[PDB]
Design a protein around this nucleic acid. Sequence first.
RNA 1: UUUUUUUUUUUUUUUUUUUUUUUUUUCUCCUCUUUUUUUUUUUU
Length: 49
Amino acid sequence: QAVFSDGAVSLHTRSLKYGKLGQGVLVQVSPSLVKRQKTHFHDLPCGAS
RNA sequence: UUUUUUUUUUUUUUUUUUUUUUUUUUCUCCUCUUUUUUUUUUUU
Protein backbone atom coordinates (compact mmCIF):
# COMPACT_ATOMS: atom_id res chain seq x y z
CA GLN A 1 0.00 0.00 0.00
CA ALA A 2 2.54 2.63 1.10
CA VAL A 3 6.08 3.20 2.38
CA PHE A 4 6.64 4.18 6.01
CA SER A 5 9.33 6.54 7.33
CA ASP A 6 11.80 3.80 8.37
CA GLY A 7 11.67 1.45 5.38
CA ALA A 8 8.63 -0.44 6.65
CA VAL A 9 5.90 -1.52 4.24
CA SER A 10 2.14 -1.66 4.77
CA LEU A 11 0.28 -4.16 2.58
CA HIS A 12 -3.44 -4.43 1.84
CA THR A 13 -5.84 -7.13 0.63
CA ARG A 14 -8.57 -5.02 -1.00
CA SER A 15 -9.40 -7.19 -4.01
CA LEU A 16 -10.83 -10.59 -4.97
CA LYS A 17 -7.63 -12.36 -6.07
CA TYR A 18 -5.88 -11.56 -2.77
CA GLY A 19 -6.32 -13.24 0.59
CA LYS A 20 -5.43 -16.39 2.48
CA LEU A 21 -4.06 -19.17 0.28
CA GLY A 22 -4.78 -22.88 0.40
CA GLN A 23 -2.96 -26.08 -0.51
CA GLY A 24 0.24 -26.25 -2.52
CA VAL A 25 4.01 -25.94 -2.17
CA LEU A 26 6.25 -22.93 -1.57
CA VAL A 27 9.70 -22.26 -3.04
CA GLN A 28 11.85 -19.38 -1.76
CA VAL A 29 14.59 -17.93 -3.97
CA SER A 30 16.64 -14.74 -4.07
CA PRO A 31 14.55 -11.63 -4.93
CA SER A 32 16.56 -10.79 -8.04
CA LEU A 33 15.67 -13.63 -10.45
CA VAL A 34 12.06 -12.51 -11.07
CA LYS A 35 11.43 -10.48 -14.22
CA ARG A 36 9.25 -7.40 -13.89
CA GLN A 37 6.00 -7.66 -15.85
CA LYS A 38 2.37 -6.55 -15.72
CA THR A 39 0.73 -9.93 -14.95
CA HIS A 40 2.31 -11.85 -12.06
CA PHE A 41 -0.67 -14.23 -11.88
CA HIS A 42 -0.49 -17.20 -14.24
CA ASP A 43 -2.69 -20.16 -15.20
CA LEU A 44 -0.15 -22.29 -17.11
CA PRO A 45 -1.78 -24.91 -19.40
CA CYS A 46 -0.22 -27.88 -17.59
CA GLY A 47 -2.60 -28.71 -14.72
CA ALA A 48 -1.46 -26.22 -12.10
CA SER A 49 -1.03 -22.48 -11.52
C1' U B 1 -14.82 43.35 -19.57
C1' U B 2 -10.82 37.39 -17.15
C1' U B 3 -15.34 33.24 -13.09
C1' U B 4 -15.12 27.76 -10.32
C1' U B 5 -12.21 23.70 -7.98
C1' U B 6 -7.97 20.43 -7.01
C1' U B 7 -7.49 16.36 1.70
C1' U B 8 -2.39 15.59 4.81
C1' U B 9 3.79 15.78 8.62
C1' U B 10 4.20 5.79 10.11
C1' U B 11 0.57 2.88 13.38
C1' U B 12 2.90 0.25 18.07
C1' U B 13 5.23 -0.70 23.08
C1' U B 14 3.87 -2.78 30.24
C1' U B 15 11.35 -7.81 27.04
C1' U B 16 13.55 -13.50 30.13
C1' U B 17 18.93 -14.65 30.79
C1' U B 18 21.67 -18.98 36.60
C1' U B 19 29.95 -16.60 35.10
C1' U B 20 35.61 -15.73 36.87
C1' U B 21 43.47 -14.86 36.81
C1' U B 22 46.03 -17.76 33.09
C1' U B 23 45.73 -20.46 28.44
C1' U B 24 50.70 -23.81 24.41
C1' U B 25 57.79 -26.46 23.69
C1' U B 26 63.71 -25.84 22.10
C1' C B 27 69.06 -30.30 23.01
C1' U B 28 73.95 -32.26 25.06
C1' C B 29 77.63 -28.68 27.33
C1' C B 30 86.98 -29.99 29.25
C1' U B 31 86.58 -24.46 35.48
C1' C B 32 94.97 -24.87 33.89
C1' U B 33 99.34 -26.25 38.03
C1' U B 34 104.08 -24.71 45.41
C1' U B 35 101.14 -28.18 48.66
C1' U B 36 99.97 -31.14 52.68
C1' U B 37 95.14 -28.30 53.91
C1' U B 38 97.04 -23.63 58.23
C1' U B 39 95.16 -23.87 63.32
C1' U B 40 98.16 -22.44 70.57
C1' U B 41 98.90 -17.38 72.06
C1' U B 42 97.48 -11.93 73.45
C1' U B 43 95.72 -7.15 72.82
C1' U B 44 88.43 -5.46 69.69
